[PDB]
Write a protein that binds this ligand. Structure first.
Ligand SMILES: Nc1nc2c(ncn2[C@@H]2O[C@H](COP(=O)(O)OP(=O)(O)OP(=O)(O)OC[C@H]3O[C@@H](n4cnc5c(=O)[nH]c(N)nc54)[C@H](O)[C@@H]3O)[C@@H](O)[C@H]2O)c(=O)[nH]1
Ligand SMILES: [Zn+2]
Length: 317
């Protein structure tokens, strides 16, 4: 039976009240989304791509091939999944943790429930002070497995399925679509950004291929560019005195890599920022047990070094 507990999400000061599916219901809805998005990945994950941080080396590849660019909305990622379950026409949004919420809307055209997986962001519309779901991309429309098309194919695929659909005040989240600009349109992009920022919280640009089929996982060819004070690592407290370490797989240990200042609990996981030659404490992470691995530390440093800027991106092209 669809078994829901209540829940609330809170974003940028506002609260949404939704129905978390729990129990065998959560599992099926997830399982169904396995089978539709045809993901034979041993372990559970949204059928979605994960961005990676742009680094200098990338520009070459950006200069050659065809990419769109967009606002990195500051929101919660979620896979929107429309399905019928046991006779209930159901609209579910899925968190990265395979957490499932009913996000229902009046006007969802019956066909969507045939099997639609679109990929988008939950976030808060600064203007209405209302919630929105911005649609990035899409993987299956109404049974039509669109993963392998090109982006735009996918985007219109999405666009016209929801064409007749209209939003009603009562509805939980305004649907909207991500306006994806082509890289070679710098002036456009800037303005697009300065438009988007006025309505939503952003964290820089996302840079996606125009042409590759949907990627499930770490998508080394999905870029993020993120204003670089928001680069963090979770170290482990290796010493009362605040020596912090990181994990090194081939050596299999945690290795000291910095010293925080003062007095800290050994074996804590602490989220830290970098500035002025040094890492600084931000908050504890009781919720971890694992520092980041060496690579990540390396990469984030590399990244904090380069201080690649939005303009550096939107000037090359
Ligand atoms: N605050 C909050 N976040 C939640 C929650 N559940 C899931 N997240 C999710 O976790 C992400 C950050 O993870 P972490 O701090 O470890 O950072 P990274 O995993 O490195 O991600 P980040 O660098 O922040 O970039 C990822 C985010 O970019 C956003 N994004 C914007 N546009 C796109 C796009 O087009 N494609 C993709 N793949 N992502 C996009 C997504 O929200 C995505 O999560 C959030 O953005 C949110 O989506 C929750 O309950 N609260
Ligand atoms: Zn052109």
């Amino acid at each position: 039976n669809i078994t829901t507990e209540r829940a609330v999400l809170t974003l940028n000061g506002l609260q949404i009240k939704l129905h978390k599916v729990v129990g065998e219901s959560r599992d099926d809805i997830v399982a169904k989304m396995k089978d539709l998005a045809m993901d034979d990945h041993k372990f559970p994950r949204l059928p979605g791509p994960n961005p990676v941080s742009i680094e200098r080396k990338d520009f070459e590849k950006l200069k050659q091939n065809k990419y769109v660019v967009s606002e990195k909305t500051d929101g919660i990622r979620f896979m929107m999944f429309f399905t019928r379950v046991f006779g209930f026409k159901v609209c579910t949004i899925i968190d990265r943790a395979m957490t499932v919420y009913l996000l229902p809307f009046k006007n969802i055209p019956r066909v969507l429930f045939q099997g639609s997986i679109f990929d988008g962001e939950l976030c808060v519309d600064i203007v209405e002070k209302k919630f929105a779901f911005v649609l990035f991309d899409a993987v299956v429309v109404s049974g039509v497995t669109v993963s392998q098309m090109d982006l735009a194919s996918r985007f219109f695929a999405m666009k016209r399925s929801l064409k007749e659909f209209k939003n009603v005040p009562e509805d939980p989240a305004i649907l909207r679509y991500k306006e994806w600009i082509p890289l070679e349109h710098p002036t456009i992009i800037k303005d697009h950004l300065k438009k988007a920022n006025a309505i939503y919280h952003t964290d820089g640009l996302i840079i996606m291929s125009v042409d590759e089929p949907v990627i499930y996982g770490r998508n080394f060819n999905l870029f993020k560019l993120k204003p670089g004070t928001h680069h963090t690592i979770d170290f482990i407290i290796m010493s009362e005195d605040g020596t912090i370490g990181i994990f090194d797989p081939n050596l299999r240990k945690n290795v000291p890599v910095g010293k925080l200042d003062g007095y800290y609990n050994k074996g804590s996981i602490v989220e830290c920022g970098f500035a002025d030659g040094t890492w600084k404490y931000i908050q504890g992470r009781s919720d971890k047990n694992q520092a980041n691995d060496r690579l990540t530390y390396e990469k984030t440093l590399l990244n904090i070094e380069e201080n690649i800027t939005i303009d550096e991106l939107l000037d090359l092209f």
